[PDB]
Symmetry: C2
Subunit: 93 residues, 2 copies
């Protein structure tokens, strides 16, 4: 959520050519001529990974993901709620 | 209230021999033989002053009358009341 080094793209088997082996999208020549594809999702198109696809989902800069990798205060009464709006009224005499 | 240098015993004419001049109780040859009377009031006795009578009514030590010599947040609604008891009760929901 996302995690530290990588995220849930590493869970999709569409990224692999075999167990532990990443699928490689296009060749050096294709990149020398056209560069990288920015909008492309290696999960949508099952044709492999382009350089930078395994880390692109992580925070920019990474210190955000490290900053939030601490502790969460989780709701455990309402299955579909994590966070809500709270309203505190203090009336004194 | 009592003051800085002297107190209200200086408004009593009974300690004066004549104007501006203080009345002297006994003489030199009394304090060498008997010592000084601590109990004696110069305003009540009417018979003159002993060494110490003029500043004895002041704070022990003096820095008290000086520390208190600042300001006063004086009540102006009730002539017989200077200080009273206050109760602040705070009820909050």
């Amino acid at each position: 959520c996302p995690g530290i080094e990588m995220t849930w793209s590493l869970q999709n088997p569409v990224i692999y050519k075999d167990a532990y082996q990443i699928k490689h999208y296009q060749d050096k020549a294709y990149f020398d001529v056209n560069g990288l594809t920015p909008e492309r999702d290696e999960c949508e198109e099952e044709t492999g990974c382009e350089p930078g696809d395994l880390t692109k989902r992580m925070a920019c800069p990474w210190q955000a993901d490290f900053f939030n990798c601490t502790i969460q205060t989780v709701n455990f009464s309402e299955p579909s709620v994590n966070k809500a709006s709270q309203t505190e009224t203090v009336t004194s005499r």
